[PDB]
Design a binder for this molecule. Structure first.
Ligand SMILES: Cc1cc2nc3c(=O)[nH]c(=O)nc-3n(C[C@H](O)[C@H](O)[C@H](O)COP(=O)(O)OP(=O)(O)OC[C@H]3O[C@@H](n4cnc5c(N)ncnc54)[C@H](O)[C@@H]3O)c2cc1C
Ligand SMILES: Cc1cc2nc3c(=O)[nH]c(=O)nc-3n(C[C@H](O)[C@H](O)[C@H](O)COP(=O)(O)OP(=O)(O)OC[C@H]3O[C@@H](n4cnc5c(N)ncnc54)[C@H](O)[C@@H]3O)c2cc1C
Ligand SMILES: C[As](C)(=O)[O-]
Ligand SMILES: C[As](C)(=O)[O-]
Ligand SMILES: C[As](C)(=O)[O-]
Lengths: 541, 540
């Protein structure tokens, strides 16, 4: 041999991602014991060596579109690696697509939070297959606009048996649902959709057009927007007909994507595809409003989990990798970088779960409903859009191996932009935040009141900043991103206080609410012990 | 047809990346006429459809390691797509590996700046093949430590004829040089290297060990660190022997990289590889100090070019893509986001080229030499490390297509971290700054005087901030990144004043030096006039 291999970091595999995360455990502290037991088992699974192999395979053995069979007939099939189906099977059995719609007494009053904690853990393992599960869970809220259609589909949708066979949906053990919104001329401006729907025999509708981005193409049906005589309408469009034949779907290509690669995203064209209208004619936008809101929470929770998993690897690496004779984690500068990132990961996780809590409490508490209506785009804006910069710095903490695809940080870095881009990007979230202030000032008083209650009298200066930003946004729409980010900082700070993470909150408040312009991590002085921040959030395991 | 395809952005291909960049033209305003002509031709090349096809192919048709031939002999060859060799050929013919060492009277007093302007443009086209050119240009500063080896190798190294054949080095039309430094147990702590060098017949040395990341493996020789009885020493190690036979290189694998994929990076093991010592025994670290410094300017210049190119695409898209009946560039919020990114790209470009100017003036100006020694890690820290976050936001400005690999932003986003990581990352740059503060505080006094002269009396508040940061860093090594980033902000602001970009400087100073903690772009109010910033830096 020419050399020895020394000073290598042992893998994080085999430990428990839930029990290694005290902030998450505090977030779940009031869950019933049965949920704690399930989260510990989930925490063990997502760091197991077998699960990590499935995640690597799903993202390297990529889905393939087969437009035709060997004799020249169209079949419009997308084939996946078995690893994809194994992840789907377990997450569907776990109810990640269905549990908020189920009647489970152990989760009463906690359905969004219980699911969000599971979602957060799974996103640390493999994020791509979460897309069909997010769309399936959220799609049922659109189906509520037509209760007969909900009653018809929900038994099949809520089934916890995953079924990827090419049977018609009504013969499958369970079904999944997708979304056909974006067209080539725009995904934001859905009223510019040119897909058209025309009445057909039997009260159905026939659709002709295209959708430029349709993820999870082997879903059994798709919520789709199309124009009718009275405006943009929403439809439930099955991929297959009752005998299993194609329903006018023509897949053109799969996207060659930066990340999210385990999840096939197709370009599709429709020729006479038959479907049911969902909601009132011309009310397509209103019909899908609650569906989109549900996907935005998932985008935040998953981005937070992505950041958590990437930073845990950086902290763990620092504890074992020696440089100049001692572990990297004993270097003051590495301590400041790791602790500074931990503050944002902590704030993003607390805020994302606080939004889930507002969803659970909205029906019984007007102030929580106010938070739920107005802050979903704030949380999606900030949590998702900080992930690329933070995951890059976490990757840099690994040195050269961090840049190599046989690890996890490269894949997570490639993944991070998708949650921010996939549905409403930053500018769309921020304008949404400003519109709600223009139409419902009372909602932001309620949020400001919750923030002020948690920060206490010392936080009144932050409240004044937020009011000034709200008022300035009415003067100038261009400052809507400033308003959105400041709201997120303040709400994350408030929740860290609510959770009792007072050392974390102190340092978070001093920097994000009191510090100066910065562009890189590590902007902490010695006033707060950095090693304590790191040990509190990433205890050595 | 089922639908019409409408509201699409016309391609930016076919225009001129140099003439479309007023800040760059201002930076080059005093270059001789012949240099202006050459930059205009390069500006057209990097946006031409032909060149763009080469850049795409070089990054999708990946190099393959061939350890053996089909009969089972070791050959240790790496094969590239012809597009890689075409980019190398043109860049070598342009002297990107050699021009600072040439005696070109047209570039007298400007060698580093003239090369940096070319580098900036080429990085907008294809960054991966720049790695061997950066290493080759920088390697000559180390070879100077042994002047007889410099005389022996420099005609071949400085040749503008690219030659990728498998001939021995002195039978080729020109040669390139790489770097064998990082080992599995560490790339930062090179004194923990375990590769060993032993005396051989004829005054040569035999090396046995491994290098964990060796880019451009078909380079003709590599500057390599290995242990001798006196400590860590530097060696020039040819890949092939005098007859074209293997010189004890055993390539194991190529890295499967996030980005930079046109540039092969190998894992290699050395078994009795014959080389020449460069510099004194045990002085390997000192010998490669200037070589490393040169590569650090290149990292900054290229990262600035990456950012410039990605933001130019986002601005161009906004001018053509309609949403809600008007161009995106007419939406106030999109204007704030684009302008806010433009301020960092302008500051990073100005600061990087200002470092190049310090390199040109160092031999004749003590204040400029002080700037070059103390601020090289500052520029590399800030310019390279802001690129990932900025290129993500630029990608988001394109919408869903931004995330797709048939465009350019996804590749640039994957490229962006490599300049920060490839040689000394942020923590290493910041500790470099802290060491210079500890061992030679007067160098930063000179930097502050230069900043103060450019900012004018209005800037005393920024000087006081920098003094406080210097004092605090002497107290606490842990705040070294704060000192480093504040120095970059202030020097970027000062250089924008030096360039006469006073509207850009005004807006940059008020935000980066006077604003609040932020994590995303778009933090400008109406006083900064976002549309004028965009039109001044990215004219349609
Ligand atoms: C991996 C992936 C999967 C996806 N899956 C699906 C799917 O299953 N179904 C589906 O229908 N779509 C899907 N999408 C598409 C996605 O929803 C769209 O890209 C998104 O809606 C934006 O639409 P666009 O690309 O047309 O951008 P545009 O509408 O052209 O917007 C471009 C940019 O301008 C900004 N902008 C927009 N409006 C304004 C304004 N008023 N003022 C200022 N700035 C503005 C946007 O925020 C964005 O940054 C997916 C996207 C990705 C990347
Ligand atoms: C694409 C690519 C190409 C490369 N090509 C080459 C090449 O051709 N030749 C070559 O020899 N190398 C090459 N490298 C290797 C590269 O130079 C090393 O990754 C780098 O030197 C860091 O070494 P490391 O991975 O061992 O990290 P480590 O030395 O283990 O450090 C890991 C992390 O700790 C930080 N750190 C280190 N010391 C300290 C400290 N004292 N205090 C605080 N933080 C600290 C680092 O900044 C980094 O964040 C390449 C790397 C990449 C990504
Ligand atoms: C609504 As069904 C899948 O049971 O036909
Ligand atoms: C960060 As804590 C409140 O779980 O110690
Ligand atoms: C961007 As300018 C140097 O023309 O002000």
């Amino acid at each position: 041999k020419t050399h020895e291999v020394t000073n290598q970091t042992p893998p994080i595999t085999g430990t428990n991602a839930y029990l290694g995360d005290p902030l998450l455990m505090q977030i779940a502290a009031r869950f019933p014991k049965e949920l704690h037991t399930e989260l510990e088992q989930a925490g063990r699974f997502v760091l197991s060596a077998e699960a990590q192999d499935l995640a690597r395979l799903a993202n390297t053995e990529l889905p393939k579109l087969r437009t035709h069979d060997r004799q020249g007939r169209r079949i419009d099939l997308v084939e996946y690696h078995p690893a994809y189906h194994a992840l789907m099977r377990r997450s569907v059995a776990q109810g990640l697509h269905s549990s908020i719609w189920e009647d489970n007494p152990l989760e009463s009053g906690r359905r969004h939070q219980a699911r969000a904690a599971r979602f957060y853990l799974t996103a640390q393992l493999e994020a791509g297959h979460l897309c069909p599960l997010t769309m399936t869970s959220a799609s049922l809220a659109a189906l509520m606009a037509s209760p007969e259609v909900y009653k018809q589909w929900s038994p099949a949708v809520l089934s916890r048996k995953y079924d990827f066979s090419q049977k018609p949906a009504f013969r499958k053990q369970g079904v999944t649902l997708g979304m056909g919104m974006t067209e080539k001329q725009g995904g934001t401006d859905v009223r510019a959709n040119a897909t058209r729907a025309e009445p057909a025999i039997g009260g159905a509708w026939r659709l002709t057009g295209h959708k430029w981005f349709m993820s999870a193409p082997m879903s059994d049906a798709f919520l789709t927007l199309a124009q009718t005589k009275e405006g943009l309408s929403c439809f439930l469009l099955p991929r297959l007909g009752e005998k299993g034949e194609s329903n006018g779907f023509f897949f053109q290509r799969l996207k060659d994507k930066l990340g999210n690669r385990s999840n096939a995203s197709s370009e599709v064209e429709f020729d006479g595809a038959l479907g049911q209208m969902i909601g009132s004619p011309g009310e397509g936008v209103k019909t899908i409003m609650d569906m989109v809101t549900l996907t935005r929470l998932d985008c935040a929770v998953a981005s937070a989990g992505l950041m958590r998993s990437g930073l845990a690897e950086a902290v763990h690496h620092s504890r074992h990798r020696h440089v100049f004779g001692k572990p990297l984690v004993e270097q003051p500068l590495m301590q400041r970088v790791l602790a500074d990132m931990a503050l944002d990961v902590a704030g993003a996780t607390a805020l994302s779960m606080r939004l889930a809590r507002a969803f659970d409490m909205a029906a019984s508490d007007r102030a929580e409903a106010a938070f739920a209506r107005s802050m979903t785009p704030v949380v999606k804006y900030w949590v998702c859009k900080i992930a690329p910069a933070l995951l890059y710095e976490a990757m840099e903490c690994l040195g050269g191996n961090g840049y190599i695809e046989d690890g996890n940080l490269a894949r997570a870095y490639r993944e991070a932009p998708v949650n921010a881009i996939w549905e409403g990007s930053g500018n769309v979230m921020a304008l949404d935040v400003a519109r709600v202030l223009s139409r419902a000032p009372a909602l932001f008083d309620g949020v400001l009141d919750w923030i002020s209650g948690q920060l206490g009298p010392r936080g009144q200066g932050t409240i004044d900043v937020l009011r000034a930003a709200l008022q300035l946004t009415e003067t100038d729409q261009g400052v809507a991103r400033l308003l959105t980010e400041q709201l997120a900082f303040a709400a994350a700070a408030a929740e860290l206080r609510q959770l009792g993470a007072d050392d974390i909150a102190d340092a978070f408040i001093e920097t994000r609410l009191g510090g100066l312009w910065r562009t890189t991590y590590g902007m902490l002085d010695a006033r707060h012990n950095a090693m304590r921040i790191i040990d509190q959030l990433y205890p050595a395991s």
